[PDB]
Design a protein around this nucleic acid. Structure first.
Ligand code: ZN
Ligand code: ZN
Ligand code: ZN
Ligand code: ZN
Length: 113
DNA sequence: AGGGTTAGGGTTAGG
DNA sequence: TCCTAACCCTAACCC
C-alpha cells in the first residue's frame, strides 16, 4: 500500500494517496476565466463551470425547482412526500434534511447529540 | 431563531 | 489502476 506523510493513512493505490494529499495543501491551481474564482480541485472547477450555463438540468416534476444532480432532486422530493427521516434522539423531533437536524443538535443540545 | 438555498469542501461509485 | 463526477457534507447568506 501507500501511506501519507502527513496523516499516515495507508491507501491501496498510488492514485488514492495523491488525490487525498490535496486535502492537506492550500494551493488552488484552477481558475475560472469567466468570473475569476479559484478552485482547489479540477472537479470543483468543472462543476462550477456548469453554473455559467444558466439552468440546472434536473427538474422537479412537482414544482419549478431545478437541481445539479439526481441525488439532490431525490432529497428534494422529501419536501413533497413529507418524509422526515432524520430524528433527534433527545427531543424526538423529525427533520427533512440531515443538515437541518445537525444544526438543530448544535443549537438546541450543545451537550452533544 | 429556524432552516431554505447556493456554492464549494472532501469522498466514493463505477466506468 | 486511474479518473470523472455524483455523492455526502457544511459554510455562508438570507428569507
Ligand atoms: Zn494525509
Ligand atoms: Zn466562474
Ligand atoms: Zn419539487
Ligand atoms: Zn432535539
Amino acid at each position: 500500500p501507500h501511506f501519507c506523510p502527513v496523516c499516515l493513512r495507508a491507501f491501496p493505490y498510488l492514485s488514492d494517496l495523491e488525490r487525498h494529499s490535496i486535502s492537506h495543501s492550500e494551493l488552488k491551481p484552477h481558475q475560472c476565466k469567466v468570473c475569476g474564482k479559484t478552485f482547489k480541485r479540477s472537479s470543483h472547477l468543472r462543476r462550477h463551470c456548469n453554473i455559467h450555463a444558466g439552468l440546472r438540468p434536473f427538474r422537479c416534476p412537482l414544482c419549478p425547482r431545478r437541481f445539479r444532480e439526481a441525488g439532490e432532486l431525490a432529497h428534494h422530493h422529501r419536501v413533497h412526500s413529507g418524509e422526515r427521516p432524520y430524528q433527534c434522539p433527545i427531543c424526538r423531533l423529525r427533520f427533512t434534511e440531515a443538515n437541518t437536524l445537525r444544526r438543530h443538535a448544535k443549537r438546541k443540545h450543545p451537550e452533544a447529540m
